[PDB]
């Protein structure tokens, strides 16, 4: 609603030229590119006080920018390095209020030597216990997304064809399925809790959807298994009396 960016998640190969785009719908003159890393917080890469203007921030090295239009601030990684794996955040501010920066949603970039470990999730829905229903007059469904890599997913619940947010909790952090491994795959759970009476109506349809961010059309793939492209994986259940 304020500032917008490239895809929320991106996976790229070491050495590749990477483009991140920030687009704002606020008519602001100032735009800023930051990265955000654990322990270090926000560090300013580059900023632009107007169209066709730019100035290096604190950590410009390895990055380029262009400000061709007022609404757009492009960040370029000429040759992606693994230490450029980060959360990239763009912000904008109106002239005269340079410091009140409004941030976009960000783009999480992972840079890897190759993409051979990229795997989409399997998704399964687990239905409410009859014991929970009689004890509490509530009903909790659980969605499990398993076996995916990298940890670039968005899970949503859809009830009767419409996304729901009330009664939902999704793990803020994934589990590593093999915590001793550097390239362990991930698992994620979510819960959706509804009233027993709602669950007991079998017309009600419940779908857990996981948007996986993986390879694009242009990425190369020479393995036996299906190319792990960006895709939605889902599982579903109906209420039961």
């Amino acid at each position: 609603v304020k500032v917008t960016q490239s895809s929320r998640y991106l996976v790229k190969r070491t050495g590749e030229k990477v483009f991140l785009e920030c687009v704002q719908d606020m008519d602001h003159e100032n735009m800023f590119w930051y990265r955000q890393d654990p322990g270090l917080g926000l560090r300013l890469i580059y900023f632009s006080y107007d169209v066709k203007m730019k100035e290096k921030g604190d950590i410009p090295e390895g990055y380029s920018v262009s400000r061709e239009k007022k609404e757009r601030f492009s960040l370029i990684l000429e040759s992606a390095s693994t230490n450029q794996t980060s959360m990239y955040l763009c912000a904008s501010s109106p002239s005269g209020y340079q410091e009140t920066q409004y941030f976009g949603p960000g783009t999480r970039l992972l840079v890897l030597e190759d993409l051979k470990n990229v795997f989409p999730p399997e998704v399964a829905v687990f239905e409410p216990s009859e014991a929970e229903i009689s004890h509490t007059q509530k009903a909790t469904l659980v969605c499990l997304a398993t076996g995916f890599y990298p940890d670039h997913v968005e899970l949503s619940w859809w009830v009767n064809g419409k996304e729901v947010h009330s009664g939902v909790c999704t793990d803020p952090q994934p589990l590593k399925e093999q915590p001793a491994l550097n390239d362990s795959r991930y698992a994620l759970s979510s819960r959706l809790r509804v009233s027993a009476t709602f669950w007991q109506n079998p017309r009600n349809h419940f779908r857990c959807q996981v948007q996986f961010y993986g390879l694009s059309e242009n990425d190369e793939w020479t393995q036996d298994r299906a190319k792990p492209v960006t895709q939605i994986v889902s599982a579903e259940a109906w209420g039961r009396a």
Binding site: Q36, G41, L42, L44, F47, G57, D58, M87, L89, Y97, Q98, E99, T100, Q101, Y102, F103, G104, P105, G106, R108, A124, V125, F126, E127, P128, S129, A131, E132, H135, T136, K138, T140, L141, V142, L144, S166, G167, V168, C169, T170, D171, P172, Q173, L175, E177, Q178, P179, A180, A187, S189, R191, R193, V194, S195, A235, E236, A237
Partner: protein, 197 residues
């Protein structure tokens, strides 16, 4: 333009508590102080303060600057679970934002009538998972001791129309030895936890 210091480092409270967050700054050419809420990754702008002793108030959130003391306070009354976030202070020095390292705030629901239970849930298609739920917010869920058993941290869900919040954690495994009876054994759970047959 050197430093911004936030306090406390982290805070865990129950819903309904008032919390106070502090920021002090040592910067040359100080112009203004900003507060951001970062729930996850992307900071949300809250307040910009330039004049001393002028409160900014956004509902339950409020802030004020004291330039003589080189400090600012962010106050949050009647906290809600949705207030849980890292709160960031930044100073503007006429050139850039100088960020503090943040205060982590966690707000837990105040579970008045806990009903701790471990339920077994079956697949819509054809493994199974265990759901530990309705425990009070002081209960701690331990990670798994076996690498073939997966256990999530606790998670708060809000059934908004019911004014009802509840904690739960999920455990699963495909191991033969695994059962809801023993799923959360590495955790300390209430002695009266309900375990259906």
């Amino acid at each position: 333009e050197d430093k911004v210091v936030q306090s406390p480092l982290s805070l865990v409270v129950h819903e309904g508590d008032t919390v106070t967050l502090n920021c002090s700054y040592e910067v040359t050419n100080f112009r203004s102080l900003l507060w951001y809420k970062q729930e996850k990754k992307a900071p949300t702008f809250l307040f910009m303060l330039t004049s001393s002793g002028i409160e900014k108030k956004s509902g339950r959130l409020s802030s004020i600057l004291d330039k003589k003391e080189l400090s600012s306070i962010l106050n949050i009354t009647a906290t809600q679970t949705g207030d849980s976030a890292i709160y960031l202070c930044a100073a503007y020095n006429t050139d850039k934002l100088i960020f503090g390292t943040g205060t982590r705030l966690q707000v837990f629901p105040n579970i008045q009538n806990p009903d701790p239970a471990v339920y077994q849930l079956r697949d819509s298609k054809s493994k199974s998972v265990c759901l530990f739920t309705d425990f009070d917010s002081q209960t701690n869920v331990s990670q798994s001791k076996d690498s073939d058993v997966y256990i999530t941290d606790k998670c708060v869900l809000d059934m908004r129309s019911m004014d009802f919040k509840s904690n739960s954690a999920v455990a699963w495994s495909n191991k033969s030895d695994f059962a809801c009876a023993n799923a959360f054994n590495n955790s300390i759970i209430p002695e009266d936890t309900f375990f259906p047959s």
